[PDB]
Design a protein around this ligand. Structure first.
Ligand code: A3P
Ligand code: NA
Length: 258
């Protein structure tokens, strides 16, 4: 029967949310929705009967999952999800905030090519190095800011933060933690993955629902544009104090600042 997701991948955008979901779909005890529901942010009015109807069917002991990257930054998401159930497990796939802003910009550049440069959107006042905190690309990277709001409705024990960089260099190691966090037996492993030279990322030997090798679509693995390293330095400096706070809240250093 259909059940409401006991675990959600709530963020972040461009941290590697699809990759993680697609890898978790290999486990025999994970059933997940395909496309981003965007329920708790854009379609909450439709109610939990609509939400439950999107979910796949599951046997007993199977875990239902979804991923919507905007939840982590959408203001009302914590209260609403906890309202669904106070026990929901939450996962955040985090990434270097600066690489994430560039990946975010690169996604838009693949849709509206005429947009200004990353360096002009970066600043409100280049002459003074004042960064546009209103720009969504900047704001999503301040993980500690959004994390504080989630901890008003969830114990940090029910929240797992996955390394987006380590998801690319050692998918089997990272997914070992995620399986422990969801009470799933360690099944996903190194043999499930393989590196495709021409893609640049790990791929699945057999995806869920397929017997063939499966890499991620053309929408994942984009070539970023070349960015002024002075802006990158000024962007790493902006995030540094926020990254340090995030490390303390999570008890883990994700290596973005050394
Ligand atoms: N095996 C894999 N194949 C492709 N992209 C992967 C990947 N593992 C992680 N990713 C990353 O996942 C990002 C997308 O995150 P999301 O699905 O949350 O939007 C990609 O951003 P880039 O295109 O900048 O490289 C890519 O870096
Ligand atoms: Na974008």
């Amino acid at each position: 029967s259909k059940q409401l997701p006991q675990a959600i991948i709530i963020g972040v955008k461009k941290g590697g949310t699809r990759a993680l979901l697609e890898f978790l779909r290999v486990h025999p005890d994970v059933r997940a929705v395909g496309a981003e529901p965007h329920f708790f942010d854009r379609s909450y009015d439709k109610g939990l009967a609509w939400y439950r109807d999107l979910m796949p069917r599951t046997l007993d002991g199977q875990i239902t999952m979804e991923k919507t990257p905007s939840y982590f930054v959408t203001r009302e998401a914590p209260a609403r999800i906890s309202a669904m159930s106070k026990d929901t497990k939450l996962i955040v796939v985090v990434r270097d905030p600066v690489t994430r802003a560039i990946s975010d910009y690169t996604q838009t550049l693949s849709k509206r090519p005429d947009i200004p440069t990353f360096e002009s959107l970066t600043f409100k006042n280049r002459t003074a190095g004042l960064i546009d905190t209103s720009w969504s690309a900047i704001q999503i990277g301040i993980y500690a800011k959004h994390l504080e709001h989630w901890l008003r409705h969830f114990p940090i024990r029910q929240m797992l933060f996955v390394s987006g960089e380590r998801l690319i260099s050692d998918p089997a190691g990272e997914l070992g933690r995620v399986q422990d966090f969801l009470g799933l037996k360690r099944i996903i492993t190194d043999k499930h993955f393989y590196f495709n030279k021409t893609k640049g990322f790990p791929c699945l030997k057999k995806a869920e629902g397929s017997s063939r090798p499966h890499c991620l679509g053309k929408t994942k693995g984009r070539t970023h544009p070349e960015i002024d390293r002075e802006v990158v330095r000024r962007l790493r400096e902006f995030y540094r104090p926020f990254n340090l706070k995030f490390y303390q809240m999570t008890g883990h250093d994700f290596g973005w600042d050394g």
